[PDB]
Each structure stands twice: as C-alpha cells, then as structure tokens.
Design a protein around this ligand. Sequence first.
Ligand code: CLA
Ligand SMILES: CCCCCCCCCCCCCCCC(=O)OC[C@H](COP(=O)(O)OC[C@@H](O)CO)OC(=O)CCCCCCCCCCCCCCC
Ligand SMILES: CCCCCCCCCCCCCCCC(=O)OC[C@H](COP(=O)(O)OC[C@@H](O)CO)OC(=O)CCCCCCCCCCCCCCC
Ligand SMILES: CCCCCCCCCCCCO[C@@H]1O[C@H](CO)[C@@H](O[C@H]2O[C@H](CO)[C@@H](O)[C@H](O)[C@H]2O)[C@H](O)[C@H]1O
Lengths: 41, 64, 35, 37, 40, 78, 38, 38, 35, 48, 51, 36, 36, 30, 29
Amino acid sequence: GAKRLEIAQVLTQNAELIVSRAANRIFTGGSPLAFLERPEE
Amino acid sequence: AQRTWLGDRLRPLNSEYGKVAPGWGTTPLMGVFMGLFFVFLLIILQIYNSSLILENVSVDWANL
Amino acid sequence: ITYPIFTVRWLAVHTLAVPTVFFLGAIAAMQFIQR
Amino acid sequence: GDAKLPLWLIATVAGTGVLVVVGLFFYGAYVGVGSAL
Amino acid sequence: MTPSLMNFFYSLLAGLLIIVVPATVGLIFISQKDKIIRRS
Amino acid sequence: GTTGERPFGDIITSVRYWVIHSLTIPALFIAGWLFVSTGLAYDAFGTPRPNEYFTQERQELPIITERQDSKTQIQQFI
Amino acid sequence: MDRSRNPNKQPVELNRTSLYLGLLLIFVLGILFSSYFF
Amino acid sequence: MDRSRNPNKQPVELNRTSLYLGLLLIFVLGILFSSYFF
Amino acid sequence: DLRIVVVLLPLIVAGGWALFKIGSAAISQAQAFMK
Amino acid sequence: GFRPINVSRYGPGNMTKSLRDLSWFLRYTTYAIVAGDPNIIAVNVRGL
Amino acid sequence: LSGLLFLAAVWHWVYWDLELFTDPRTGEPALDLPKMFGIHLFLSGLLCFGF
Amino acid sequence: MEVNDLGFVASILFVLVPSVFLLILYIQTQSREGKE
Amino acid sequence: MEVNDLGFVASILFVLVPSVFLLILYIQTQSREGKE
Amino acid sequence: MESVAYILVLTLALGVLFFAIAFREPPRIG
Amino acid sequence: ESVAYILVLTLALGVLFFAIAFREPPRIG
Ligand code: CLA
Ligand SMILES: CCCCCCCCCCCCCCCC(=O)OC[C@H](COP(=O)(O)OC[C@@H](O)CO)OC(=O)CCCCCCCCCCCCCCC
Ligand SMILES: CCCCCCCCCCCCCCCC(=O)OC[C@H](COP(=O)(O)OC[C@@H](O)CO)OC(=O)CCCCCCCCCCCCCCC
Ligand SMILES: CCCCCCCCCCCCO[C@@H]1O[C@H](CO)[C@@H](O[C@H]2O[C@H](CO)[C@@H](O)[C@H](O)[C@H]2O)[C@H](O)[C@H]1O
C-alpha cells in the first residue's frame, strides 16, 4: 500500500496533463483541456 | 450564428482558441533564432556602413 | 539591530563616487599647471 | 559601536570641503592655460 | 579572412566574453544563493 | 518604511566609516593629481600638450581628410 | 444570408466645453499654417 | 435681471431619406454651376 | 612606462586599507546566505 | 474506419460531457489502484 | 479593384456572426491569433517566393 | 488652359457648406430616435 | 502681389472640415438630453 | 485648375446614387 | 489672398467670446 499510494501520488498531479495528451489525438478544432469543467477547490 | 458554405471550410482553422503548449515551451529555439537574427542584422548594418568591408564588395556606385 | 555591510547600493553609490573624487583630484590639479 | 558624532558638525567640513574644490576652480579661470594670460 | 571582418569578429568574441557571461553567471550565481522564502 | 539595510544617517554616525575614509578619499584624490602632473593623460588619452599643437612643418590646423584609413594620417600629423 | 441587429455601437459624447478646445485648436492651426500655404 | 428656462424650442427631425434628397440636390447644383464658376 | 606605476600606487593603498580595517566583518558577511 | 472528430461539428454542450469523462476514466483508475482491486473499473465500464 | 474591394467592404458590415468568429466553448466572438499567424505568413511566404 | 482662378474656391463651398449643414441635421435626429 | 494660387483652397478646408467634424459631434451629443 | 473639380462633384453625386439604393430605410406597415 | 487671415483670425477671436458667455456652468453635486 505504500507503493500503491505512490502510484496515485504520481497520477494525481499529472492527471491535468494526461487528458491533454489524450484528447489531442481525438479532437482537432479546439484546444480542449481549457474546455474541461474541472471541479473547483 | 449563420452557417455559410464559406464558414464551414474555415471553422476548423478557427475551431480552437486557447489551446496552448505546456510550461515554458519552445522558448529557447525562438531565442537562438533571435540571436542568429540580431547577429545577421548586425552584419548587414556594417556591410552598408563599410565597417565590415570585405574583398570584392565595394559598397559604392560601381555596381550592377 | 545588525545590517549587512555590502549590498547592491554599496555598489550603486561607489560607482559615480570612485570616479568622482578621482576626477575631482584630476580637475583640482590641472589648474596649477600652466602653458 | 557607540562612537556616533553629530552629523551637523561633519555637515560643515564636508560642505566646506565641497566649497574649497569649487572655489579652486574659480581660482583656475584666472591663472593657467585657459586664462588668456 | 579579411582584416575588417576579423576586427569585427573579435568584438563578437569580446562583447560576448566580457558583457554577457559576466552578466549571466554574475546574476544567476547570486540569485540562486539568496533564494526568497515562500513559506512565510 | 524600512528597506532592510542600514540608513545613511546611521552610516556616517558610525566612526568605523571614517577610519576607512580618513586615508581613502584623500588617496583617491591624490591619484587624480598624479594622472595629470605626470602627464599620463596627455599620453593615454589623446590630448595634445600645450606646446605641441603646431610643429615647424605644420601650421595648418589639422583635420582628418579621409575616413577609410584614418590611422597613418594622425601619425603623419604627429 | 439574413440580417440582424447589432449588440454594439456605443454613441459619442463630445462635450460643450470640449467643442471649444477643438474649435480653438483648429483655428490656431489655421492662423499658423495659412501663411505657409501662401 | 435673472435668468430662466425656455418653455419653447422644439427640435428638428430631418429624416434619413430626406438627407438623400438634400444631398443629391446640392450635388446636381454642384455639377450644374461649377462650369459657370470657371 | 614607469609613470603608470606611480599613479596606481594610491589606487592600491586605497584597497590596501580596505583589507585591514573592515574585512574581518566582510568574511562573516561572505559567510552569509550559506554560500 | 476511425477519423478524429471536429469540435465544431460535435457541439460545445455535447463535448462538455465528453471531456469530463476522460478525466473520469483515470480518476477511477487512480481509485482502483489504492483500492487494490480492479473491480470498480471492471463494473462501471461494462456496457458504457 | 477598389470598387470590388468596397462592394465586399459593405458585405461584412451588414452580415456578422457568420459561425466563424466565435469559439465552440461559448458564443462570445473571439478569434485565434497564433494559428492564424501561421496561415497569414505562409501566404506571404508563398508570395515573396513568387516575387 | 484658362480658368477663372476662383471657381475651385467657389464650387467647393457651394457643395460642402449646405451639405454639411444637411449632414449636421441628420445626426441629431438619429440621437433623438435612440432616446438616450 | 504674388501668391501660391491654391492656399485659399487649402486653408479653407484645413479650417472647416475638422471643425464641422467637431460641430457634428457636439450637436450629436447635446440633442441626446432634451426629453424626447 | 479645373479638371479634377468636375470629376470630384460628379463621383460624389454618383456615390449618393449608390447609397440611397442600398441604405434606404425599411418602410414598416401600420 | 490677404483676407484669409482676417477670416480665420476673427473666428479665433470669435470663439474667445463664445467661451466666456456660453460656458457650461459647473454645478456642485
Ligand atoms: C523578410 C522580409 C522582407 C524584406 C526585408 C524585404 C525587402 C525589400 N522588399 Mg520585399 N517583400 C516581402 C518581404 C520582404 N521584402 C514579401 C513577403 C513580399 C510579398 C508581399 C514582398 C513584396 C515586395 C514588393 C512587391 C516590393 C518589395 C520591395 C522591397 C525592397 C524595398 C522595401 C523595403 O525596404 O522593405 C523592408 C522591409 C522590412 C525591413 C520588413 C521586415 C519586417 C521584420 C521581419 C520585422 C521584425 C524586425 C524585428 C522587430 C527587429 C528585432 C530583431 C532583433 C534585433 C531582436 C526591399 C529589397 C519593393 C521594391 O521597390 O524593391 C524591389 C517592391 O517593389 N518587396
Ligand atoms: C479625411 C478627413 C480628415 C478629417 C480630419 C479631422 C481631424 C479631427 C481632429 C480633431 C481634434 C480636435 C481636438 C478635440 C479636443 C477635445 O476633444 O476635447 C478635450 C478632450 C476631453 O476628453 P475627455 O476625457 O473629457 O472626454 C470627454 C468627451 O466628451 C470628449 O470627447 O481631451 C482630448 O481629447 C485631448 C486631446 C486634444 C486636446 C487638445 C487641447 C490642446 C489645444 C488647446 C487649444 C489650442 C490653443 C493654443 C493657444 C496658442
Ligand atoms: C450663410 C449660410 C448659407 C448656408 C446655405 C444652406 C442652404 C440649405 C439648403 C438645403 C436644401 C436641402 C433640401 C432638403 C430636402 C428635404 O428636406 O427633404 C424633403 C422634405 C421632406 O419634408 P417632410 O414634410 O417629409 O418633413 C420631414 C422632415 O424630416 C424634413 O425635415 O421636403 C422638402 O423639404 C421639400 C423641399 C425640398 C425638396 C427638394 C427635392 C427636389 C430635388 C430632388 C433632388 C434633385 C435631383 C435632380 C435630378 C436631375
Ligand atoms: C555619489 C554620492 C555619494 C554621497 C552620498 C552621501 C549622500 C547622503 C547624505 C547624508 C544623508 C542626509 O542626511 C540626513 O540628515 C538628517 C538630519 O536631519 C538625518 O536625520 C537624522 O537625525 C537624527 C540624527 O541626529 C536622528 O535622530 C534621526 O532619526 C535621523 O533621521 C537623516 O536621516 C539623513 O537622511
């Protein structure tokens, strides 16, 4: 579980970048991550 | 919001607006193309002043 | 209480004062010499 | 340090130190290489 | 090589070597020593 | 308000400033005296001496005729 | 293909006293430059 | 001796299409009379 | 070129007084910011 | 037979459900990693 | 040409919001400038190489 | 070619100063229409 | 007496056509208040 | 001189011939 | 040729008169 938290502790701060890697291959006309309605603090 | 035949061929050229490269980006590629460009501007300013005069240039009215 | 000795302003005030009184010693000597 | 001395006193001797080096220049217009003498 | 090109080329040596690298090393190797504190 | 460093009325009030300025600002003053009493500013900077304007071969108020070379002419102008 | 109405075009608000500044400024440029046009 | 406010001064109502008639009428008088001023 | 030698001799006694009289506190200020 | 879809033909109200799913596909992946069992991925995806 | 420029100049004054000037994220009029700089200059890059 | 030397003064004030009189009076009506 | 033959065209359009521009915009503005 | 004085007032009359056709106000029925 | 100044000078003097009589009176609020 100490290793399993470290996998989440690499993915949680990298999740905002990883959708911009993901959505940029399936979407063309607009820079999509800005269209993401992220949950606010 | 009026669709034309014109505007359905350029809306993929103007579909996105704030899509942006990540943090600090391709800045120093643009920096080293700038520093090559300022040196190129500094060379041609003294080609024309005859202060980096070379052989067989002779910036003068003896020309073609 | 305690302040640092050298700072940016120690270099800001010495520049245009080290070439001031070295030039003030220059100009005060040139009137004593003559043609 | 506690060796502080009244500024006003050294306001004089820096001020007349300024006064003698601009008073020497107006002496220098009247003898020397630019005086036409 | 021409005697006015290399007299210009020695400037691009010296205007680099005196002005630029003692600005860059002369800024970033003192700002990285005196780092500001963000923890308040 | 404050800046972080020592104020100016706290500097000159300190006697440690005047031990390093009883022998230094006269020392930089006398170095300017020797820059011209030895005549080094005549040689290092390009100032003509006040006997060496006009030579026996030259009374004709020197100016630089040609921009392109401009370095053997001053040595010809002495 | 079909017209609409603009959600735009704010009007202009040149004041009474600001007319006097602009009318004077053209007339000093009138009495300055009319000699040079002759 | 003391001022007041007018119970008067109706404003003017020159139409958009009536501008076109007046602008055309001056311009046909422009192209008519400019030969005679020369 | 002996005359350049005598004119920098007040330049080097300027900094030569700067060594002995303050500089014990300067190395402690050079000990500052952990570098 | 796949082509990448354009946003202008798709719709902004149609894609605002789309882009939050892409975070949600990995948000439940980060949930399942610390949960130690991939059951929550393998039960909220069947027939999606 | 300036007559054919002026007749096209009066066309865009009466017709705006031609589905090209807004983002899909909301309906406010806003146009992408750096993607358009790549298509302005590529036409000027073609036209200098022609010249 | 001969010319009267002053018609270009005359037929530039004959065309403008009644038309900018007329161009003054159309704008005011537009403001009134607006109700501002 | 000599003259440039065209300054009276030039310095009658230099003074008028910005001032009747300015005289358009005051009567633009002042007629908005007045309770239509 | 005079030759541009005719062509000015001609094409300024012709400009209103374009403007009154296109920018006629719409008549509304009531 | 000569009455083009005295045209435009008296318009410059005329606007000096109209700024003294017909100024906007500044009302305190
Ligand atoms: C690289 C750009 C460039 C440059 C330098 C020139 C230069 C020239 N053209 Mg030209 N031209 C170009 C592009 C360029 N052209 C293109 C793309 C077209 C097609 C539209 C034309 C079409 C054209 C025609 C039709 C004609 C010319 C003419 C001319 C000549 C005179 C006009 C002049 O001085 O322009 C100088 C222009 C510039 C200096 C603009 C450069 C803008 C730069 C990129 C701005 C960036 C500088 C930057 C802010 C500085 C900081 C850098 C660094 C210090 C950090 C000259 C030889 C005319 C002529 O009479 O000669 C035959 C002529 O008839 N050209
Ligand atoms: C092809 C067609 C060509 C047409 C050309 C038309 C040109 C138009 C140029 C008009 C300029 C008119 C200036 C308007 C003036 C004006 O608009 O009022 C003053 C104006 C007031 O601005 P505010 O912020 O108060 O805005 C309130 C609004 O009501 C103003 O519109 O301030 C300025 O505009 C500053 C710039 C002009 C300041 C000029 C004052 C200095 C000169 C003083 C007088 C000279 C006396 C000299 C004594 C020797
Ligand atoms: C010292 C200063 C000198 C300054 C001089 C200023 C002079 C001003 C003179 C302006 C007159 C402008 C006319 C306005 C015209 C105008 O105001 O619009 C038409 C106008 C409409 O009146 P209405 O009853 O509709 O009123 C509605 C209001 O909005 C009008 O103000 O009817 C008339 O005024 C009739 C008289 C003019 C009719 C003229 C039409 C005939 C000519 C047609 C065009 C010619 C084509 C010829 C083809 C070959
Ligand atoms: C090239 C330039 C090099 C020259 C540099 C020298 C410039 C500085 C000049 C000296 C500074 C001016 O000196 C100014 O004197 C006043 C006296 O009223 C001081 O005022 C001081 O008064 C007394 C000291 O007895 C204290 O109680 C007080 O707290 C303090 O403010 C100011 O703090 C100082 O700003």
